[PDB]
Design a protein around this ligand. Structure first.
Ligand SMILES: CC(=O)N[C@H]1[C@@H](OP(=O)(O)OP(=O)(O)OC[C@H]2O[C@@H](n3ccc(=O)[nH]c3=O)[C@H](O)[C@@H]2O)O[C@H](CO)[C@@H](O)[C@@H]1O
Ligand SMILES: CC(=O)N[C@H]1[C@@H](OP(=O)(O)OP(=O)(O)OC[C@H]2O[C@@H](n3ccc(=O)[nH]c3=O)[C@H](O)[C@@H]2O)O[C@H](CO)[C@@H](O)[C@@H]1O
Ligand SMILES: CC(=O)N[C@H]1[C@@H](OP(=O)(O)OP(=O)(O)OC[C@H]2O[C@@H](n3ccc(=O)[nH]c3=O)[C@H](O)[C@@H]2O)O[C@H](CO)[C@@H](O)[C@@H]1O
Ligand SMILES: CC[C@H](O)P(=O)(O)O
Ligand SMILES: CC[C@H](O)P(=O)(O)O
Ligand SMILES: CC[C@H](O)P(=O)(O)O
Lengths: 418, 418, 418
């Protein structure tokens, strides 16, 4: 277990270049199982989840290689059982199931891992795929899916909003016979990106980014080149880093329209924000943030993947702020870790009530999941003294070179063995 | 999203006439799928859930009409697949499954909605129906049930207490061959009402209201007229309205024996209560309540559907009071909303620790579920200033004309578009 | 509902003799379904769970008798459906399923009860058994398993650590054809004990106590005599009893190597500990404990079954201590009960933050589960005045003669009807 050792307080100031989105790179990598000619995916972050997906892909029979891009040749996929050891390490592995079924008529994928922030069922993926014509059973721990012949498109009303199940159904639909309509579709920018990737390959899709997507199945998808959009959560995290540290930053290679709610909330906190076409600047003008209220919800509302980060901002802000998490039922694990650093929070139900303090103290804390870990490192940067964040591998699932990026803003961080 | 705008403080005083029970009207409406002659159900509240059930019923092929009564002619039911869009909006839709199977040999119902106050599985309904002889599978999101021929009665020990699964098994049993015994049956007054409805139709049932119900199957049920019992929770809510507001009320068209535990607890809080045959009066004699301790449990203990309401009473009472919720695992969502109004609560596990304050403050709050919403409106009536309760549609699931009823007691409420 | 009435404060001092482990006696009793000659199991505690298991065993066709030992003759097992009424009362009943399948080719067991400290799924047991070749379905509430012929050994990587599913797979593997490897196996001392029991009977097992167990199936198991190891949790509870009461104790018939983490934590709390080969002594030298931090995890880390107990120690200790529960998601029910006795705890997520007080007060409290109940009795022993712990039957699931043992240390306890 690597740990980060952080020494504060430090103010965070400067610039950062945003990497491709974790959560777009991932569904695109799996969507490439559909492709029957080679694909190049540009602007792909170097993340643990990306490495594992490439390995998983390779074990199905794909030819895979990366640099700034990931190259995938999926023409000769010939294994339909995903490797369990890889699947259990992340959420995104669930996305092998859909394409394997749609293209090959069968697939077997065990239940995913990922962030331990809820029970995280996959029932809507399974329901969707069944509505498209698949037969599914859970056996030995695998989700085992099949269909004789093609899937058949269907009108599918999603019972609840779900990013991942939207991707599964949209992807599988691209090779079904007929038309699929997804109602109550997730609107996240990563589904738009995924959809636009698919279209590059020859898919017929419209409505992505709205609550309804329409897909007309085609016989085969081709190949192509596609560049992944910037990471909005990595963006938001670095904007929070400057905001809590009374700083200023510019974020380069950004996409500001994927952050409306976040930027507004940062303005509410007292931040001076400007945006251009592909960059965002934040300036606190030396001031401590003001407390804000937040309620998480699906895009384009305030994102659950920025909740932990805003927890911390509210805990060193001026005032009382209320943060309500509606999307996941166990995503306050960062809170007691913050309380070990002197924070004043109280949880009531799905809400953390935060009373901001001027300064935190250094402490031995432990990362529980990707965004909690980032949050605890940011805490360590502004806290007095030394913080040791244990189990920092979590961070590497979602941030390329966080240590380097933060270092470049002024942080004093060390990565340490154990 | 309609909202309520409330202006306080206001004292609540006067009288109210209690409507039929939400939670008896609902299972009776679905039980009427059994009937092979027309039925008249009297004293049926005008509630969102009732409207939806009538529409659902009509889509199966029933002829349905209402005024003070709902009229159902179920003779020509000929669709066995319930409409998903209606089913997802409420709990009660689960009750279409049992009667469809018992009478027609098949039925398909997707998973219900309703109050977001727990995971709310339906496994005991499915287990019960299987014990009666049904074959069940979950596929595309539906619970799909069938049996060749009649169900067969069985001795069924309910693994845990459940209102809804008691109703499902009791209802389905009425057309099975032989005798069914339900052990560990729920005893709620709405199951008694349901049972007595069924008996009006020709069912052979005994033991309702006790922990064991015995049903002897008959070949067919007929028709009839039946009046739904008063709503105990609407009763309790209005009694709490007067209790927290230092008031006095009489509740007309009430059934006081369905409220033993609630009335005792209201006496513990300092209320002067009297009861007659069909009415209940409460007088606080101008005083602020005293804090009480409460533990929810199945009937005839203190009901979970009054828990939110008593949360509020304890938060403006004199003293420290402990409220333990044992029935549902996510039914404290009203708590942080109350804390936004200045309440002093702390949650520990399944318990809210409440330290009563003299006055609340007006605040923008949001309703999460039916009884939380009612509670937040009551809070708004006694709070200083303006409260806006967002997402008030929740209330209309369970209260007919709440705005009008409260207005008649002195409240200053406005319903506002959005 | 029996209750305990406790009068404090009382200091707890003296000696105690530790009984056999609840949680080894239980899996061994069920493992004995494998045996085709008689078995004698020595040092078996007199516990409610043991009584129920013997009755369950007898209803499958075993001949069962006990004194200090339990005698089992399983040669004529001839019923494969476990009695539901017995199964629902405890966790351990799940362990009938594996042996019935491995030896007889079929078995039907409803879902277990036990401690209400989480959802407690059995999916890893079912997945494991399927990997060994079983066919499984859930129907009428039963887990129904079968295989034609023997099971076949498999390489099984356990998706998460699980004590019970490790036992199920290891036990069933003893009669499969070929070799089974369990990776990510639970290492608890009770799995070692179980494994060594099995080996007495002729099983071929190695690796128990490590994260990998290897089993080579044999054709039949025989009989034998085996003595159950001491109860580590009962040990830890009595060590906590003396620690919180500023006392001193010696624990006889103990196994100190099963308690490394606990003993270290007790040293951190200020305890003077000594150990011999089969005994442990603790002396506080008259002092109040110091607060400690704890994080639960699988063996050999700090055990979840001592978490409640250490909650209490931290709440009467000097200082602030943080207790993080990672194993079960609803195991803080003792906390509000402790708060009724004047404790200063706050829960945040999976962590209880404890600020120790000098003295508790007597209160009416209620036991929710086995280890919470023991904890509340210990609280009652050091609290000022009278404590009544309701629903004390929970204690009898895991402690033989707790009342007598504590009495012998100086406690003033009464067991009372209701
Ligand atoms: C790899 C990836 O893209 N991860 C992101 C994705 O996760 P993910 O796709 O897992 O999130 P979902 O939108 O599906 O989850 C939404 C809610 O729906 C539930 N649900 C989801 C699927 C299902 O079949 N059944 C079901 O009940 C979940 O338990 C959760 O409570 O979107 C989340 C919501 O923005 C982000 O936090 C994650 O970082
Ligand atoms: C429409 C209606 O009548 N609603 C009422 C009904 O709901 P409802 O019928 O849903 O409530 P239940 O009594 O069934 O629920 C009791 C507990 O058992 C669980 N459970 C229930 C069914 C099942 O198959 N499996 C299972 O595990 C539930 O998750 C809950 O934790 O009774 C509740 C308990 O008084 C009230 O709060 C609801 O307002
Ligand atoms: C009779 C007995 O021996 N009881 C002990 C046993 O319980 P038990 O065997 O039930 O505990 P487990 O180790 O299996 O449970 C570990 C975690 O894994 C989960 N899980 C377990 C099995 C499964 O199929 N699926 C699954 O998801 C559980 O919900 C829990 O969250 O070990 C626990 C952990 O030390 C102790 O607290 C219990 O006193
Ligand atoms: C929620 C944390 C991560 O983004 P995952 O969804 O597990 O990949
Ligand atoms: C618990 C809230 C409502 O009564 P529902 O059970 O959803 O109809
Ligand atoms: C966790 C409490 C008990 O040891 P059980 O596991 O239910 O036997």
């Amino acid at each position: 277990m690597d740990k980060f050792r952080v020494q504060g307080p430090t103010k965070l100031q400067g610039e950062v270049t945003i990497s491709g989105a974790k959560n777009a790179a991932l569904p695109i990598l799996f969507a490439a199982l559909l492709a029957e000619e080679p694909v190049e995916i540009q602007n792909v972050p170097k993340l643990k989840d990306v490495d594992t997906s490439m390995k998983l892909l390779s074990q199905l029979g794909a030819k895979v290689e990366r640099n700034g891009s990931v190259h995938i040749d999926a023409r000769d996929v010939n294994v339909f059982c995903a490797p369990y050891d890889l699947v259990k390490t992340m959420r995104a592995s669930i996305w092998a199931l859909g394409p394997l079924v749609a293209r090959f008529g069968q697939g077997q994928v065990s239940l995913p891992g990922g962030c331990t922030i809820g029970a995280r069922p996959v029932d809507l993926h399974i329901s969707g795929l069944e509505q498209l014509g698949a037969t599914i059973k859970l056996e030995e721990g695998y989700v085992k899916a099949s269909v004789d012949g093609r899937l058949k498109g269907a009108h599918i009303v999603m019972d609840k909003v779900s990013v991942g199940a939207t991707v599964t159904i949209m992807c599988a639909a691209t090779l079904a016979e007929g038309t699929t309509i997804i109602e109550n579709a997730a609107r996240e920018p990563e589904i738009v990106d995924t959809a636009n990737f698919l279209i590059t390959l020859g898919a017929k899709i419209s409505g992505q980014g709205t609550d309804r997507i329409v897909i007309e199945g085609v016989e085969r998808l081709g190949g192509g080149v596609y560049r992944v959009l910037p990471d909005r959560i990595e963006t938001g995290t670095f904007l929070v880093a400057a905001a809590i540290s009374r700083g200023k930053i510019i974020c380069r290679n950004a996409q500001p329209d994927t952050l409306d709610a976040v930027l507004a909330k940062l303005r509410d906190a007292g931040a001076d924000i400007e945006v251009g076409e592909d960059w965002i600047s934040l300036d606190m003008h030396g001031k401590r943030p003001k407390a804000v209220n937040v309620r998480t919800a699906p895009h384009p509302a305030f994102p659950t993947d920025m909740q932990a980060q805003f927890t911390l901002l509210n805990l060193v802000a001026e005032g009382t702020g209320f943060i309500t998490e509606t999307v996941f039922e166990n995503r306050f694990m960062h809170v007691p870790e913050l309380s070990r650093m002197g924070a004043h929070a109280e949880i009531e139900s799905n809400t953390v009530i935060c009373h901001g303090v001027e300064k935190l103290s250094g402490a031995q804390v432990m990362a529980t999941d990707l965004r909690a870990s980032a949050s605890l490192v940011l805490a360590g940067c502004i806290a007095e003294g030394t913080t040791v964040v244990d189990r920092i591998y979590h961070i590497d699932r979602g941030y390329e070179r966080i240590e380097d990026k933060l270092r470049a803003l002024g942080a004093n961080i060390e990565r340490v063995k154990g």
